[PDB]
Coordinates of C-alpha atoms and ligand atoms in Angstrom, one line a residue:
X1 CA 151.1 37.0 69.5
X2 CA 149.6 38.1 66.0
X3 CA 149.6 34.5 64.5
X4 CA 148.3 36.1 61.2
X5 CA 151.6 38.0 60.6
X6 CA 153.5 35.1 61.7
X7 CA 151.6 33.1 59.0
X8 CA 152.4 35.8 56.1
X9 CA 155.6 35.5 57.2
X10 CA 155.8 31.3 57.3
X11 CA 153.9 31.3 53.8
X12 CA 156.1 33.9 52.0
X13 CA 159.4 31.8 53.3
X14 CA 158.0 28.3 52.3
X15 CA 157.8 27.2 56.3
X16 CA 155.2 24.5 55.7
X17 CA 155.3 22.8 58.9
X18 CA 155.3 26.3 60.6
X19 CA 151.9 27.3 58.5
X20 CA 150.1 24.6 59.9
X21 CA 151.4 24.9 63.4
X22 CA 149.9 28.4 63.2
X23 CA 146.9 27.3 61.5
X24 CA 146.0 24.9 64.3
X25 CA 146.7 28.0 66.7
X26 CA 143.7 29.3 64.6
X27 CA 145.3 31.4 62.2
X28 CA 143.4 34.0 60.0
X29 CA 144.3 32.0 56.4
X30 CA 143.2 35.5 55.1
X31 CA 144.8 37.5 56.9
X32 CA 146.4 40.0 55.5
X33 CA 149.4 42.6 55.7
X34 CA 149.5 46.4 54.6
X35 CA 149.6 45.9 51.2
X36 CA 146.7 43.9 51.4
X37 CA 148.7 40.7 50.3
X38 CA 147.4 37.5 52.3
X39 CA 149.0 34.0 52.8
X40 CA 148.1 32.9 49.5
X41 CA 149.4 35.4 47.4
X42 CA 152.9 35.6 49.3
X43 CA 152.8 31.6 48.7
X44 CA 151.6 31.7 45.0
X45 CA 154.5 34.3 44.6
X46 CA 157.1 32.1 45.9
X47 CA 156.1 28.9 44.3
X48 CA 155.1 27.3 47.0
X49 CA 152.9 24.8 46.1
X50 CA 152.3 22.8 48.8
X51 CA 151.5 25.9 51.1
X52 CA 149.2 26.9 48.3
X53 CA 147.1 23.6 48.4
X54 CA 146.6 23.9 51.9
X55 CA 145.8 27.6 52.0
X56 CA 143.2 26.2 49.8
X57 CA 141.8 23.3 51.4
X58 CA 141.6 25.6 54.6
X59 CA 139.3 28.0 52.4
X60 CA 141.7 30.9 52.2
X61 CA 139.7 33.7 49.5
X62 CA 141.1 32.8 46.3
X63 CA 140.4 36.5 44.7
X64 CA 140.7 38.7 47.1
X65 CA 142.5 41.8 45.7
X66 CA 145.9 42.9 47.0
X67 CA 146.6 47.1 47.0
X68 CA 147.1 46.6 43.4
X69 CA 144.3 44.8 42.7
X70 CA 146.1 41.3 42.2
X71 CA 144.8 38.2 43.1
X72 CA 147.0 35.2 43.9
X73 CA 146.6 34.3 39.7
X74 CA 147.5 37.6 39.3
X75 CA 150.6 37.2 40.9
X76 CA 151.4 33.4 39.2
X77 CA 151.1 34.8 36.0
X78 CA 153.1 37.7 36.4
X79 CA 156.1 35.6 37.5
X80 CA 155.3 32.7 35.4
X81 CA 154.8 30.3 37.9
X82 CA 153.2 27.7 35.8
X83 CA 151.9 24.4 38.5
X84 CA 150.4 27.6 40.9
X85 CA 148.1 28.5 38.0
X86 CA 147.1 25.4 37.4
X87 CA 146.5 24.4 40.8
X88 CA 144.3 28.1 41.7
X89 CA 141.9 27.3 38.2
X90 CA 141.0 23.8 39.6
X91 CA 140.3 25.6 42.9
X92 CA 137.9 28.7 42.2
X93 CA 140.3 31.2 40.7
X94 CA 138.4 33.7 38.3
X95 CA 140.3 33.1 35.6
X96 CA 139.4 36.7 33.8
X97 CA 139.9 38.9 37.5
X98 CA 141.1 42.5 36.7
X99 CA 143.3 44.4 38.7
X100 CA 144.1 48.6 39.4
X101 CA 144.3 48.5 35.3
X102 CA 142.5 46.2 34.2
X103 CA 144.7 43.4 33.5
X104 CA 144.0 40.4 33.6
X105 CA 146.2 37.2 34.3
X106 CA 146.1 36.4 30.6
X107 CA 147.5 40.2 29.4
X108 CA 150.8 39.3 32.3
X109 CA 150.9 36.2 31.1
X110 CA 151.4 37.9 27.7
X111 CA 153.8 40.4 28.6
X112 CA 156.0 37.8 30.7
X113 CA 155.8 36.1 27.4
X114 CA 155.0 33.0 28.8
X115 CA 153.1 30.5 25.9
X116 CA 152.2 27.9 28.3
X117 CA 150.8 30.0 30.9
X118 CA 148.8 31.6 28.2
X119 CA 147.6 28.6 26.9
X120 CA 146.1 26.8 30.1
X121 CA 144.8 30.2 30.9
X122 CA 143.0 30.6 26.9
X123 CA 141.9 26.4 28.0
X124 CA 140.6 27.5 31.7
X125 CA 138.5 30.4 30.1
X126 CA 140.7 33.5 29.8
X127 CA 138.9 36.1 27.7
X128 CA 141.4 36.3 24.8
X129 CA 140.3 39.8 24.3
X130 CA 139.5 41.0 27.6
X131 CA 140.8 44.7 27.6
X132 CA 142.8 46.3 29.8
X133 CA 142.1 50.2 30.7
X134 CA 144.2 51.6 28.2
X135 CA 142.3 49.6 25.8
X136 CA 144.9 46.5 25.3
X137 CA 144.3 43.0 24.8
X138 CA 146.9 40.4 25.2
X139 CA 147.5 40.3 21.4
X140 CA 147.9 44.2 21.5
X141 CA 151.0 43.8 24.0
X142 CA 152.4 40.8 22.2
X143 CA 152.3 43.1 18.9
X144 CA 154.2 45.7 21.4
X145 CA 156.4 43.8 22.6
X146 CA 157.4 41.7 19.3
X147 CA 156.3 38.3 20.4
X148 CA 155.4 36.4 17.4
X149 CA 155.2 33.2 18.7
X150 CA 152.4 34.6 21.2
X151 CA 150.8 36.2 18.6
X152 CA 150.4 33.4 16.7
X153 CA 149.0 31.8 19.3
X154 CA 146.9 34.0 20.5
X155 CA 145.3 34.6 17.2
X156 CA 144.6 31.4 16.8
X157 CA 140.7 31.0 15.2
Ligands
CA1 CA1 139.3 23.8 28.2
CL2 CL1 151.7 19.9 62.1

């Protein structure tokens, strides 16, 4: 029995009492699948929060970089999934983590469009001009993509 595919599988489908079945099997909290995604980020990128917290208590990496270089914050940003990034900064995220190109949370944040995601990010630390590898900072893709309000925001003295 691979009990670190079955947990993938129980965190991505929000099967809480399931994850900590497998967890007191011994379960790898960081395992991982092909793509490099573990427990936590298929949890963060459902919105699961309570599978998130106790990825967390139980240690899982809270960085560790998927096959596109995401980590779980990565991923909550992206989607906009506003209580997981909260929860991952009060629990050892690196709040400025770059992926495959660069990005960090706060530029998907940005180009999600998201202000209050941006804003707790800018409050937890965010670089607010962290650049991506085609030379972007968050403001750059809020000009791009006609945001106002976010660039307001983000250039904010
Ligand atoms: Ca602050
Ligand atoms: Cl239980």
């Amino acid at each position: 029995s691979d009990l670190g595919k079955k947990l993938l599988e129980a965190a991505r489908a929000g099967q809480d009492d399931e994850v900590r079945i497998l967890m007191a099997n011994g379960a790898d909290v960081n395992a991982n699948d092909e793509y490099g995604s573990t427990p936590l980020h298929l949890a963060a990128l459902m919105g699961h929060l309570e599978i998130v917290e106790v990825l967390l208590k139980h240690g899982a990496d809270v960085n560790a970089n998927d096959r596109n270089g995401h980590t779980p914050l990565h991923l909550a940003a992206i989607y906009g999934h506003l209580e997981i990034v909260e929860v991952l900064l009060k629990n050892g995220a690196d709040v400025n983590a770059n992926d495959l190109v660069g990005k960090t949370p706060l530029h998907l944040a940005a180009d999600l469009g998201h202000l209050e995601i941006v804003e707790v990010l800018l409050k937890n630390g965010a670089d607010v001009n962290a650049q991506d590898k085609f030379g972007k900072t968050a403001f750059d893709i809020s000009i791009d993509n006609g945001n106002e309000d976010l660039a307001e925001i983000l250039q904010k003295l």
